[PDB]
Each structure stands twice: as structure tokens, then as C-alpha cells.
Write a structure and sequence with these properties.
2 chains; A: mainly beta; three-stranded antiparallel beta sheet; B: mainly beta; two-stranded antiparallel ribbon; 0% helix; elongated; Trafficking protein particle complex II-specific subunit 130 (chain B); Trafficking protein particle complex II-specific subunit 120 (chain A)
């Protein structure tokens, strides 16, 4: 996974497409069953303690963040991080394979940070 | 008298297409319950009924809980009220009568029309800028809703 972003230095009242790019692997050959695989996008404060789904007065977005990918090819995804009253955020993902709890199988470490003035 | 109380096949006719009939449905309405009939006919189709075939009249009309049968009306909007239910029934009859044959029908449809996409709001308000944040939810439990504009 890489994370392609527009700017790291946006002001408050502005709308940003975020673009993750995922690369499914040769070693997906163990399963093939759920071709669909559910990710998440989690937002960290760049101190600790991630914001909730109800990111009230911090970050805004379009739709539920679960936003599936294929185990086929280089799928893309998006959100619209409509920022509000912040500074120094962080974005990272995880992979969950399903919807249930204990479906989560890996946690990537790609942590693109952006600042808000 | 045939006296066939049981032990047979009962009814042996089919509601096929390529014939002038009636069709009552509901679409595109803003939080106030209605219905919409459709008449796919030609050459002066006659009047039709729209009864209230309920047990205790929960699917009520506005002032007097009426049936209010139409007359040469194809598509309309029966703006009802709701006297505490989530299911209904509707016996609908239509004297078609194309040419030298008193064509009629009686369809007892069972439309239930509670809302699905239950939507709540929240504003936030900064200095000379302003944002809403809309909650979107399905009023039924574990029957899913797709959604493709807002």
C-alpha cells in the first residue's frame, strides 16, 4: 500500500481527495475465496488516541470508510477529507477480510501525515 | 354441484401480459404516504375503484376515512394518513370495458410503505464558515439499502 495525497499543508476550509493505492500480492494464493476484502481507514492525532467514527469538529468525510478492494489487481479508493479546525493529522489503514470482529489480519504501517493551519 | 371441497387443483388461469390492466405502486415521495396507479390502455377506459380493504382502518383518509373511487384517472396520489400501523391492504377494481365486453378485475394488493432511509442531521458552526454533517441510516433492521446520490 502507498498513500497518494494532494497537499500536506492545507488551510481549514478546503476539500481534499485522499487516494490510497493497494497492490494485492502473489501470496494471496492461500485463499481466493472472498475476492472482496474490506479495509478501514483510521485517523490518528499524531500524538496518540485515534478519533472516533463521529469525528466531530475534527475531520469530515463522505460515506463509510470501509470501501472494499479486490484480490485481483491494483484497485484504488478515495475519501474527501474536508478538514475543520486542526493541525498535524495522520492516516493509516488496516485489512479486515470480512465484517466481523477478529476478521482483521494485518495492520499496515504507511502513516502519511498532513498539517492543517 | 361439483362438491369439490378438496382433492384437486383449484385455479388454473394466469395474469399474463399484452393486455390492458391496472397497476398501483409508490415511488418518489417526500415523507408523506401516498400511492400511484397506472393505466396502460387505449380508447376510453372507464372508471375504477380504490377501496380500503383493511380490518380496522389504519390506512385512513384525511377527514372522513373514505375509499374515494376514481373516475377516468390513470395516475394520481392518494395522500392518506397513518392510524398506527406498518402494513395494509388495498382491494382495487377497474371496469375496463374495451369494446362490447364489460371487462373488469379485482386485485387485492398488500402495500406496506414505511420509510427506509432514516436520516438525522448535525451542524457545526465556526467563525463565518458553516458545515453540516448528515447521519444516514436504514429504518428496517438487516434489510439493506443502496444509495447513489445525495
Amino acid at each position: 500500500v502507498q498513500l497518494l495525497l494532494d497537499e500536506p499543508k492545507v488551510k481549514v476550509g478546503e476539500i481534499i481527495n485522499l487516494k490510497i493505492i493497494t497492490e494485492p500480492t502473489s501470496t494471496c494464493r492461500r485463499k481466493q475465496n472472498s475476492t472482496v476484502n474490506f479495509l478501514d481507514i483510521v485517523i490518528f492525532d499524531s500524538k496518540t488516541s485515534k478519533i472516533l467514527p463521529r469525528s466531530n469538529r475534527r475531520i469530515l468525510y463522505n460515506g463509510s470508510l470501509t470501501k472494499p478492494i479486490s484480490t485481483t489487481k491494483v484497485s484504488e479508493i478515495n475519501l474527501e477529507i474536508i478538514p475543520i479546525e486542526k493541525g498535524r493529522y495522520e492516516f493509516s489503514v488496516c485489512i479486515s477480510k470480512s465484517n466481523n470482529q477478529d476478521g482483521i489480519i494485518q495492520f499496515d504501517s504507511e502513516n502519511v501525515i498532513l498539517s492543517v493551519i | 354441484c361439483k362438491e369439490s371441497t378438496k382433492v384437486l387443483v383449484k385455479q388454473a388461469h394466469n395474469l399474463n401480459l399484452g393486455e390492458y390492466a391496472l397497476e398501483l405502486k409508490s415511488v418518489q415521495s417526500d415523507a408523506l404516504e401516498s400511492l400511484q396507479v397506472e393505466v396502460e390502455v387505449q380508447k376510453n377506459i372507464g372508471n375504477m375503484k380504490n377501496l380500503p380493504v383493511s380490518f380496522s382502518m389504519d390506512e385512513i383518509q384525511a377527514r372522513k376515512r373514505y375509499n374515494t373511487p376514481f373516475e377516468n384517472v390513470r395516475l394520481e396520489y392518494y395522500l392518506l394518513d397513518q392510524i398506527t400501523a406498518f402494513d395494509l391492504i388495498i382491494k382495487t377494481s377497474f371496469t375496463k370495458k374495451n369494446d362490447q365486453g364489460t371487462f373488469g378485475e379485482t386485485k387485492k394488493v398488500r402495500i406496506q410503505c414505511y420509510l427506509q432511509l432514516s436520516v438525522s442531521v448535525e451542524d457545526i458552526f465556526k467563525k463565518d464558515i458553516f458545515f453540516f454533517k448528515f447521519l444516514l441510516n436504514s429504518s428496517v433492521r438487516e434489510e439493506p439499502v443502496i444509495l447513489y446520490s445525495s
